[PDB]
Amino acid sequence: PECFTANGADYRGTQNWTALQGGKPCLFWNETFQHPYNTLKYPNGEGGLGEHNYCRNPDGDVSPWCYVYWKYCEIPACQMPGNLGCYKDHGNPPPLTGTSKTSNKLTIQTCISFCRSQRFKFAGMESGYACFCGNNPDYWKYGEAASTECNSVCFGDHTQPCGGDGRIILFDTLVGACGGNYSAMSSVVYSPDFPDTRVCYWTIRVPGASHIHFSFPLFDIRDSADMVELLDGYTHRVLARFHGPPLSFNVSLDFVILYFFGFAVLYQAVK
């Protein structure tokens, strides 16, 4: 997995063809001087830009893209954990049965935060303005669709996609939550309200794990005043502190707490 954002702004991958099936080639960033995004404009790899033609999103568009006249990149690996894909929608029955609403200022988190309040574990955005909530495991009923088909911008934030009509983009409602209990072998903990701009803690507990490996593919804390803690859940000894993190570390427990005073922290446990 190579993005932990909703718009792939973190993506640094190799792909230089907009579509893996039937794609036009990407022009090189250094040769993009004519266009606003140039290796000159951003140096030493800022914005992921570099002497290459790989797909990138240096302007907070909804998704990675590259110049050609300019096109989105369809990348399977670029999908934030928490995002279940985007699926087709052919009307009733809808993919998420439970509830619906519409907002002119809708954003991925607003939709999530909304479904979370009803206690639905799944949320969907359609056409930029429609939010749907369900506990349906079969949101994939109508079939999986390419990611680019979900790129309609959220009306509340144009940096994020909210799906296109007949196309719905699915999020686990745990994303961005203020706290939570985590049981799976691995998952990602996102800063609260992620993807949109309180203090909260997350308890990660996996029975019979010898150790857990932590990872911070996204670290973006605004001030040293702000801080992220990791804590042994049994004793509450501090295993790490961070302010405004080397690539990984292993913790030899099955019970840890994440405390925050965005970021994405990926934990992958060993049984």
Ligand SMILES: *[C@@H]1O[C@H](CO)[C@@H](O)[C@H](O)[C@H]1NC(C)=O
């Ligand atoms: C894509 O990038 C690779 C190196 O990562 C390069 O060898 C290749 O020529 C590029 N492909 C195209 C079609 O531009």
Ligand SMILES: *[C@H]1O[C@H](CO)[C@@H](O)[C@H](O)[C@H]1NC(C)=O
């Ligand atoms: C950009 O870098 C590529 C790869 O080294 C090179 O082929 C291209 O001509 C470069 N041009 C400039 C102006 O930096």
Ligand SMILES: [Cl-]
């Ligand atoms: Cl269709």
Ligand SMILES: [Cl-]
């Ligand atoms: Cl909350």
